[PDB]
Design a protein around this ligand. Structure first.
Ligand code: MG
Ligand code: MG
Ligand code: MG
Ligand code: MG
Ligand code: MG
Ligand code: MG
Ligand code: MG
Ligand code: MG
Ligand code: MG
Ligand code: MG
Ligand code: MG
Ligand code: MG
Ligand code: MG
Ligand code: MG
Ligand code: MG
Ligand code: MG
Ligand code: MG
Ligand code: MG
Ligand code: MG
Ligand code: MG
Ligand code: MG
Ligand code: MG
Ligand code: MG
Ligand code: MG
Ligand code: MG
Ligand code: MG
Ligand code: MG
Ligand code: MG
Ligand code: MG
Ligand code: MG
Ligand code: MG
Ligand code: MG
Ligand code: MG
Ligand code: MG
Ligand code: MG
Ligand code: MG
Ligand code: MG
Ligand code: MG
Ligand code: MG
Ligand code: MG
Ligand code: MG
Ligand code: MG
Ligand code: MG
Ligand code: MG
Ligand code: MG
Ligand code: MG
Ligand code: MG
Ligand code: MG
Ligand code: MG
Ligand code: MG
Ligand code: MG
Ligand code: MG
Ligand code: MG
Ligand code: MG
Ligand code: MG
Ligand code: MG
Ligand code: MG
Ligand code: MG
Ligand code: MG
Ligand code: MG
Ligand code: MG
Ligand code: MG
Ligand code: MG
Ligand code: MG
Ligand code: MG
Ligand code: MG
Ligand code: MG
Ligand code: MG
Ligand code: MG
Ligand code: MG
Ligand code: MG
Ligand code: MG
Ligand code: MG
Ligand code: MG
Ligand code: MG
Ligand code: MG
Ligand code: MG
Ligand code: MG
Ligand code: MG
Ligand code: MG
Ligand code: MG
Ligand code: MG
Ligand code: MG
Ligand code: MG
Ligand code: MG
Ligand code: MG
Ligand code: MG
Ligand code: MG
Ligand code: MG
Ligand code: MG
Ligand code: MG
Ligand code: MG
Ligand code: MG
Ligand code: MG
Ligand code: MG
Ligand code: MG
Ligand code: MG
Ligand code: MG
Ligand code: MG
Ligand code: MG
Ligand code: MG
Ligand code: MG
Ligand code: MG
Ligand code: MG
Ligand code: MG
Ligand code: MG
Ligand code: MG
Ligand code: MG
Ligand code: MG
Ligand code: MG
Ligand code: MG
Ligand code: MG
Ligand code: MG
Ligand code: MG
Ligand code: MG
Ligand code: MG
Ligand code: MG
Ligand code: MG
Ligand code: MG
Ligand code: MG
Ligand code: MG
Ligand code: MG
Ligand code: MG
Ligand code: MG
Ligand code: MG
Ligand code: MG
Ligand code: MG
Ligand code: MG
Ligand code: MG
Ligand code: MG
Ligand code: MG
Ligand code: MG
Ligand code: MG
Ligand code: MG
Ligand code: MG
Ligand code: MG
Ligand code: MG
Ligand code: MG
Ligand code: MG
Ligand code: MG
Ligand code: MG
Ligand code: MG
Ligand code: MG
Ligand code: MG
Ligand code: MG
Ligand code: MG
Ligand code: MG
Ligand code: MG
Ligand code: MG
Ligand code: MG
Ligand code: MG
Ligand code: MG
Ligand code: MG
Ligand code: MG
Ligand code: MG
Ligand code: MG
Ligand code: MG
Ligand code: MG
Ligand code: MG
Ligand code: MG
Ligand code: MG
Ligand code: MG
Ligand code: MG
Ligand code: MG
Ligand code: MG
Ligand code: MG
Ligand code: MG
Ligand code: MG
Ligand code: MG
Ligand code: MG
Ligand code: MG
Ligand code: MG
Ligand code: MG
Ligand code: MG
Ligand code: MG
Ligand code: MG
Ligand code: MG
Ligand code: MG
Ligand code: MG
Ligand code: MG
Ligand code: MG
Ligand code: MG
Ligand code: MG
Ligand code: MG
Ligand code: MG
Ligand code: MG
Ligand code: MG
Ligand code: MG
Ligand code: MG
Ligand code: MG
Ligand code: MG
Ligand code: MG
Ligand code: MG
Ligand code: MG
Ligand code: MG
Ligand code: MG
Ligand code: MG
Ligand code: MG
Ligand code: MG
Ligand code: MG
Ligand code: MG
Ligand code: MG
Ligand code: MG
Ligand code: MG
Ligand code: MG
Ligand code: MG
Ligand code: MG
Ligand code: MG
Ligand code: MG
Ligand code: MG
Ligand code: MG
Ligand code: MG
Ligand code: MG
Ligand code: MG
Ligand code: MG
Ligand code: MG
Ligand code: MG
Ligand code: MG
Ligand code: MG
Ligand code: MG
Ligand code: MG
Ligand code: MG
Ligand code: MG
Ligand code: MG
Ligand code: MG
Ligand code: MG
Ligand code: MG
Ligand code: MG
Ligand code: MG
Ligand code: MG
Ligand code: MG
Ligand code: MG
Ligand code: MG
Ligand code: ZN
Lengths: 59, 118, 204, 7, 122, 131
RNA sequence: GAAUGCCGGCAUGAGUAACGAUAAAGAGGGUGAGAAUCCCUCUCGCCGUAAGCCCAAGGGUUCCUACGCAAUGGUCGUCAG
RNA sequence: CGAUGUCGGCUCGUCGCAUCCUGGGGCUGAAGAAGGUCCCAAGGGUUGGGCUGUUCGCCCAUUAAAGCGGCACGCGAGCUGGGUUCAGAACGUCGUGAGACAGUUCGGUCUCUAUCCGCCACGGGCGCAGGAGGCUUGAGGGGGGCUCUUCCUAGUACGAGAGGACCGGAAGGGACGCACCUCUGGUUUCCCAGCUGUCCCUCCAGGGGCAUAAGCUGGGUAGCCAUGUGCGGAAGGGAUAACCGCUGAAAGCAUCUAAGCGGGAAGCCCGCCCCAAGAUGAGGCCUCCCACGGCAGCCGGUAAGGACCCGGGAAGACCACCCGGUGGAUGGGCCGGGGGUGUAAGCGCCGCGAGGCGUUGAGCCGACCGGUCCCAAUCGUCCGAGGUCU
């Protein structure tokens, strides 16, 4: 190769247009039917330890 | 292309991957429940379900087969005498994988539990 | 212009006059008509064909209303055959006879991101004699200052497959109405289990 | 006379 | 699958022993010659005092190949060597005998003389 | 649907059950209907079966022979209608399922490596005593 | 306002390349505000004319123990030269 | 000249036409066949070798043909580095010499990261005046476009003979293209077996690690594949080129032309295959929801719907797409089958023994075709119309 290099400084506008796809999506969260805490779906609740209606794990 | 290929690679060559599965099998069959990453957990299910099923047969051929992976005679004894009998009427499905809610701190990896079924 | 929706099931050969004939097996019928396209209302002529029964539990209301006006149980897929107006309200394999000649359309197998050698049969580079990390590369992609650009349609790496492909003039080797089966000589685009369309050939 | 020969 | 540079045994008594294909006489640019195809060859090894000698540029017809040839009936046949028979510009053999089996594909391709001189036609 | 059953259904009209079972290492004579010029003939091809690749109806087998100083291998579909009969001429005991290695062997080396499968020979002689 | 000027500050390339031998990891149990990364156990792998041990040079407290984690450590750190 | 890398090759093309072939023609010192020469034609095609750094050229074997040229003598942020073109060395030659020579000879560092335009692919956003789920028209693009041999006509027409057709009709190829995996042939990193050395478990037997990121070897399913298989170029319609006419004045004759009308190319338009309504000119059809509460606008709750999350997938870099989510066969296990390996361990028997025999096509057994709720797709959440004006 022969070492490609930026020809011009990217403008404020242009580097910020690049970043129009960078906003985080908030975590998706359901209430736990036992303890009512907000938790990710399809995970064992980290607050009361329940999943599928039964105790699975110690919190 | 990966069309119709079974088996995770898990970024391990062939002998390391087989050793990974064997060590996880020993750990599961020893403690009943272990925590791993989700992908590893999902692969353990099959590897351990086969060893348990062979323990259900109980013959000498099964034991020597299972010994090829687990290597530990006391562990196989617990598998043939204590573990396998509780699955006598269960047609497969001896292991379950439930996902955990929090990721590791140092690498964000998603964790799951793998346990033997009641 | 007779047509029918089908699913590719697999390949085999049969023997016919002490000759081995590679065939691919297609399950075609039965295909109910759920809407007819008229010049008066739609500007052209075609039959909307249904195919494969569907669990009504997963058919939404707007689709459920479509099937109802036709008097048809919910079906998995709807495809139109153009310039085809079957007398009946159901199309089966029996619109084809052995020895006829058909065009088959399916979705080719998807190769994802294909290099220039697989996609375009480029010659790549040498594998020794100094070749430096270019063994599978495409070579030059242009000229110099004139024209100082790359033609549209330049053959390059990119997604290949999982596209509509019609292979044409396939002999209908056999048709088994009792099982809605259709044997066609040769190769049919796509995987086993994929959706195909079988139409009378446009080759004379 | 194999196989190529020398002579 | 014979191509230029390929060596072939000669299955006749023309005096040749080994020929090297230098051309596949099949259209403008045939990549390969199979059973029944004519080639142009250099004679690379001959026995003394034969019809052909080392260095002759001869024509020959491929009579059997190590690549299996497929048949419309779904069967195939393969040999343990690539052999050919030296011929003239009228497709006639230039010797009086042919040795070893030949592929029946020669008959349909127009080499009735060779097929008759063959001890076996497979 | 069951795509596998549909294919076996298509193949069922062409499946043969009259031919004798054999194994790699068995010496075999295949009576095979060929066409030559005008008419059709029955040409026998006798040799050692060096492989059987199985795919149900699409199973095939390769038979190797030395003819006038030349090795000849022939591949046959097991359900080919051009097969009149198959005569087991000898049972051989192999330890491999594919016997390509006999291509590099002399005739006495082969005879030493593939010896008569005395067990299955007795089985054939015990049958045919059907009466 | 320019001297490929000088000194300093801050941008762009960019959340990009990279994170330094492809000998390789897994689990359990501790500790702690916090643990893939520290301690312990079991399992696995790697060196073994070394990737083990002992001198000399050179280095100069880096040794041991306690207490710590802002920075140094290519991540983390409750650990550490 | 604060740098526009300089021959040739390779790779990738694309264009011109003064056309090498193929298609269409006129003239011929054209009997036929085969040529010559000029006109039209750039759609496609335009081989493999020996020599030489070579371009070129010569030669070998073919071919329908082996075209000529532009694109920075196309293309080194694409590769090569043989030649040329630094430093070493030598020959011939020149120079007293140091040295010198489009004279020769051997050798001689070619820079991981693409900002912008461009190109190949893939998304996100907004729009297409209600909100939605489907199915579509095709403006406009793109792909493709080659050709030979044999046979019949017919040994006819033509020709003293040798030779040898038009037109029409069959069959078989070469190269290329798309798709495919039934067959043939590959691969198949653990699917099976055999083997050596070593260390180990547990002493025998049986096994496990390492010997590569498979220790080695013999095999090998699905998948991905070509050497394998299917299929394609068309047909057909229309308008033309050169060229050939019909009728026909000007110009009582003649004239294809001035009025008018025929015929006529592999070429042009359509036809085939693929993309395609951001076609903002934002199209069409079928179906669903429905007129809600609160001060062409706002905020809320919803409808039809969709998204999130999860099980996955011959779909895939992420994204997208497609399927499924307990009213379920989506993956994992289990069972049956297929398929691979090729007769496990244990025991019994024969042999002093290595081994052998039987049990036994046994045992093991990835992906393929299915079955089975045994395990996991729990439970849910958030968006989402009330339809501007003549
Ligand atoms: Mg480079
Ligand atoms: Mg480099
Ligand atoms: Mg760089
Ligand atoms: Mg600049
Ligand atoms: Mg920049
Ligand atoms: Mg800035
Ligand atoms: Mg800003
Ligand atoms: Mg700004
Ligand atoms: Mg930008
Ligand atoms: Mg970015
Ligand atoms: Mg985003
Ligand atoms: Mg690939
Ligand atoms: Mg790969
Ligand atoms: Mg799968
Ligand atoms: Mg997978
Ligand atoms: Mg595996
Ligand atoms: Mg990796
Ligand atoms: Mg790695
Ligand atoms: Mg790793
Ligand atoms: Mg990694
Ligand atoms: Mg290894
Ligand atoms: Mg353990
Ligand atoms: Mg515990
Ligand atoms: Mg853990
Ligand atoms: Mg882990
Ligand atoms: Mg399994
Ligand atoms: Mg879960
Ligand atoms: Mg999570
Ligand atoms: Mg951490
Ligand atoms: Mg970290
Ligand atoms: Mg038939
Ligand atoms: Mg579907
Ligand atoms: Mg399809
Ligand atoms: Mg489709
Ligand atoms: Mg596909
Ligand atoms: Mg793919
Ligand atoms: Mg490539
Ligand atoms: Mg390729
Ligand atoms: Mg491909
Ligand atoms: Mg391709
Ligand atoms: Mg190449
Ligand atoms: Mg190559
Ligand atoms: Mg290479
Ligand atoms: Mg180099
Ligand atoms: Mg290099
Ligand atoms: Mg490079
Ligand atoms: Mg390289
Ligand atoms: Mg330039
Ligand atoms: Mg340049
Ligand atoms: Mg320009
Ligand atoms: Mg795609
Ligand atoms: Mg296509
Ligand atoms: Mg045809
Ligand atoms: Mg059926
Ligand atoms: Mg699919
Ligand atoms: Mg001879
Ligand atoms: Mg002589
Ligand atoms: Mg000589
Ligand atoms: Mg001869
Ligand atoms: Mg011979
Ligand atoms: Mg004969
Ligand atoms: Mg099948
Ligand atoms: Mg015979
Ligand atoms: Mg023999
Ligand atoms: Mg032996
Ligand atoms: Mg023996
Ligand atoms: Mg025996
Ligand atoms: Mg200033
Ligand atoms: Mg100034
Ligand atoms: Mg300044
Ligand atoms: Mg500067
Ligand atoms: Mg500058
Ligand atoms: Mg200055
Ligand atoms: Mg400065
Ligand atoms: Mg400074
Ligand atoms: Mg500074
Ligand atoms: Mg300062
Ligand atoms: Mg500065
Ligand atoms: Mg700064
Ligand atoms: Mg910066
Ligand atoms: Mg930045
Ligand atoms: Mg990123
Ligand atoms: Mg990152
Ligand atoms: Mg970048
Ligand atoms: Mg870097
Ligand atoms: Mg990186
Ligand atoms: Mg590095
Ligand atoms: Mg590293
Ligand atoms: Mg590292
Ligand atoms: Mg190393
Ligand atoms: Mg390495
Ligand atoms: Mg090592
Ligand atoms: Mg472990
Ligand atoms: Mg760990
Ligand atoms: Mg650990
Ligand atoms: Mg812990
Ligand atoms: Mg830590
Ligand atoms: Mg830990
Ligand atoms: Mg570590
Ligand atoms: Mg420790
Ligand atoms: Mg040692
Ligand atoms: Mg060693
Ligand atoms: Mg120091
Ligand atoms: Mg610190
Ligand atoms: Mg710190
Ligand atoms: Mg801290
Ligand atoms: Mg401090
Ligand atoms: Mg630091
Ligand atoms: Mg740090
Ligand atoms: Mg560092
Ligand atoms: Mg602490
Ligand atoms: Mg210390
Ligand atoms: Mg200059
Ligand atoms: Mg400058
Ligand atoms: Mg400059
Ligand atoms: Mg420059
Ligand atoms: Mg011209
Ligand atoms: Mg011409
Ligand atoms: Mg012409
Ligand atoms: Mg004259
Ligand atoms: Mg003439
Ligand atoms: Mg002429
Ligand atoms: Mg042209
Ligand atoms: Mg051209
Ligand atoms: Mg050369
Ligand atoms: Mg040479
Ligand atoms: Mg010259
Ligand atoms: Mg010619
Ligand atoms: Mg040439
Ligand atoms: Mg040129
Ligand atoms: Mg110029
Ligand atoms: Mg050119
Ligand atoms: Mg010039
Ligand atoms: Mg020049
Ligand atoms: Mg140049
Ligand atoms: Mg250049
Ligand atoms: Mg370069
Ligand atoms: Mg160059
Ligand atoms: Mg350049
Ligand atoms: Mg460049
Ligand atoms: Mg390149
Ligand atoms: Mg060099
Ligand atoms: Mg040089
Ligand atoms: Mg020279
Ligand atoms: Mg030089
Ligand atoms: Mg001198
Ligand atoms: Mg002198
Ligand atoms: Mg003088
Ligand atoms: Mg010089
Ligand atoms: Mg000079
Ligand atoms: Mg010079
Ligand atoms: Mg000179
Ligand atoms: Mg010299
Ligand atoms: Mg050297
Ligand atoms: Mg860029
Ligand atoms: Mg690059
Ligand atoms: Mg720019
Ligand atoms: Mg979009
Ligand atoms: Mg709407
Ligand atoms: Mg829609
Ligand atoms: Mg359309
Ligand atoms: Mg159009
Ligand atoms: Mg446009
Ligand atoms: Mg077009
Ligand atoms: Mg064309
Ligand atoms: Mg005649
Ligand atoms: Mg005559
Ligand atoms: Mg006549
Ligand atoms: Mg006459
Ligand atoms: Mg004709
Ligand atoms: Mg082409
Ligand atoms: Mg292709
Ligand atoms: Mg395929
Ligand atoms: Mg393919
Ligand atoms: Mg295959
Ligand atoms: Mg297959
Ligand atoms: Mg095979
Ligand atoms: Mg195959
Ligand atoms: Mg395979
Ligand atoms: Mg295994
Ligand atoms: Mg053994
Ligand atoms: Mg030894
Ligand atoms: Mg060992
Ligand atoms: Mg011990
Ligand atoms: Mg032992
Ligand atoms: Mg070890
Ligand atoms: Mg070692
Ligand atoms: Mg190693
Ligand atoms: Mg090695
Ligand atoms: Mg091994
Ligand atoms: Mg192998
Ligand atoms: Mg193989
Ligand atoms: Mg091919
Ligand atoms: Mg063709
Ligand atoms: Mg006239
Ligand atoms: Mg007239
Ligand atoms: Mg007149
Ligand atoms: Mg006129
Ligand atoms: Mg006209
Ligand atoms: Mg006329
Ligand atoms: Mg016309
Ligand atoms: Mg044509
Ligand atoms: Mg479309
Ligand atoms: Mg639209
Ligand atoms: Mg559309
Ligand atoms: Mg427009
Ligand atoms: Mg507008
Ligand atoms: Mg509008
Ligand atoms: Mg619309
Ligand atoms: Mg319309
Ligand atoms: Mg996925
Ligand atoms: Mg999903
Ligand atoms: Mg995706
Ligand atoms: Mg969608
Ligand atoms: Mg959909
Ligand atoms: Mg869904
Ligand atoms: Mg659902
Ligand atoms: Mg749900
Ligand atoms: Mg749903
Ligand atoms: Mg399922
Ligand atoms: Mg299942
Ligand atoms: Mg899976
Ligand atoms: Mg089976
Ligand atoms: Mg079997
Ligand atoms: Mg035995
Ligand atoms: Mg046994
Ligand atoms: Mg004894
Ligand atoms: Mg078996
Ligand atoms: Mg198993
Ligand atoms: Mg099975
Ligand atoms: Mg299959
Ligand atoms: Mg059920
Ligand atoms: Mg909930
Ligand atoms: Zn809870």
């Amino acid at each position: 190769a022969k070492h490609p290099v930026p020809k011009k400084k990217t403008s404020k506008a242009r580097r910020d247009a690049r970043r129009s796809h960078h906003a985080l999506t908030p975590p998706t969260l359901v209430p736990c039917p036992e303890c009512k805490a907000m938790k990710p779906p399809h995970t064992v609740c980290p607050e009361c330890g329940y999943y599928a209606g039964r105790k699975v794990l110690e919190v | 292309m990966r069309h119709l290929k079974s088996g995770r690679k898990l970024n391990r060559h062939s002998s390391h991957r087989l050793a990974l599965y064997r060590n996880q099998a020993k750990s599961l069959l020893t403690h009943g429940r272990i925590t791993t990453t989700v992908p590893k957990a999902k692969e353990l299910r099959g590897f351990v379900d086969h060893l348990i099923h062979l323990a259900k047969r109980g013959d000498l051929h099964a034991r020597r087969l299972v010994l090829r992976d687990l290597q530990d005679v006391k562990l196989v004894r617990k598998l043939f005498d204590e573990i396998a009998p509780r699955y006598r009427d269960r047609q497969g499905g001896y292991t379950r994988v439930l996902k955990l809610a929090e990721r590791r701190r140092g690498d964000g990896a998603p964790l799951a539990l793998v346990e033997l079924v009641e | 212009m007779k047509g029918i929706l089908g699913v590719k099931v697999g390949m085999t050969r049969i023997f016919r006059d002490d000759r081995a004939v590679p065939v691919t097996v297609i399950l075609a019928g039965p295909c109910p008509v759920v809407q007819r396209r008229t010049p008066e209302k739609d500007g052209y002529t075609a039959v909307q064909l249904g195919f494969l029964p569907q669990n009504p539990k997963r058919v939404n209301r707007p689709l459920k209303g479509h099937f109802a006006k036709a008097g048809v149980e919910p079906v998995r897929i709807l495809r139109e055959i153009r310039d085809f107006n079957p007398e009946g309200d159901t199309v089966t394999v029996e619109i084809f006879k052995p020895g006829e000649r058909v065009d088959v359309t399916g979705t080719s197998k998807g190769r994802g991101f294909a290099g220039v050698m697989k996609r375009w049969n480029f010659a790549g580079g040498p594998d020794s004699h100094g070749a430096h990390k270019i063994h599978r590369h495409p070579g030059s992609i242009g000229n110099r200052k004139t024209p100082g650009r790359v033609y549209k349609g330049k053959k390059m790496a990119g997604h290949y497959g999982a596209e509509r492909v019609t292979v044409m003039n396939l002999e209908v080797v056999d048709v088994i109405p009792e099982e809605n089966l259709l044997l066609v000589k040769g190769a049919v685009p796509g995987p086993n289990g994929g959706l195909v369309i079988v139409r009378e050939t446009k080759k004379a | 006379a194999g196989x190529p020969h020398k002579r | 699958m014979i191509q230029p540079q390929t060596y072939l045994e000669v299955a006749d008594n023309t005096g040749a022993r080994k020929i090297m294909c230098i051309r596949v006489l099949k259209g403008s640019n045939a990549k390969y010659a199979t059973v029944g195809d004519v080639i142009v060859a250099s004679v690379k090894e001959a026995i003394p005092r034969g019809a052909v000698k080392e260095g002759d540029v001869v024509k020959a017809v491929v009579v059997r190949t190590k690549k299996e040839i497929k048949r419309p009936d779904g069967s195939a046949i393969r040999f343990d060597d690539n052999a050919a028979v030296i011929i003239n510009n009228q497709l006639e053999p230039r010797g009086t005998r042919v040795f070893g089996p030949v592929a029946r594909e020669l008959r349909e391709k127009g080499f009735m003389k060779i097929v008759s001189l063959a001890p076996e036609v497979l | 649907m069951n795509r596998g059953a549909l294919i076996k259904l298509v193949e069922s009209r062409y499946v043969r059950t009259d031919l004798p079972e054999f194994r790699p290492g068995d010496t075999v004579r295949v009576s095979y209907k060929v066409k030559e010029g005008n008419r059709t003939r029955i040409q026998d091809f006798e040799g050692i079966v060096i492989r059987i690749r199985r795919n149900g109806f699409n199973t095939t087998f390769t038979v190797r022979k030395v003819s006038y100083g030349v090795g000849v291998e022939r591949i046959f579909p097991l359900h080919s209608p051009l097969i009149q009969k198959i005569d087991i001429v000898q049972r051989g005991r192999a330890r491999r399922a594919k016997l390509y290695f006999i291509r590099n062997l002399s005739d006495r080396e082969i005879r030493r490596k593939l010896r008569a499968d005395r067990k299955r020979i007795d089985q054939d002689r015990a049958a045919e005593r059907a009466a």
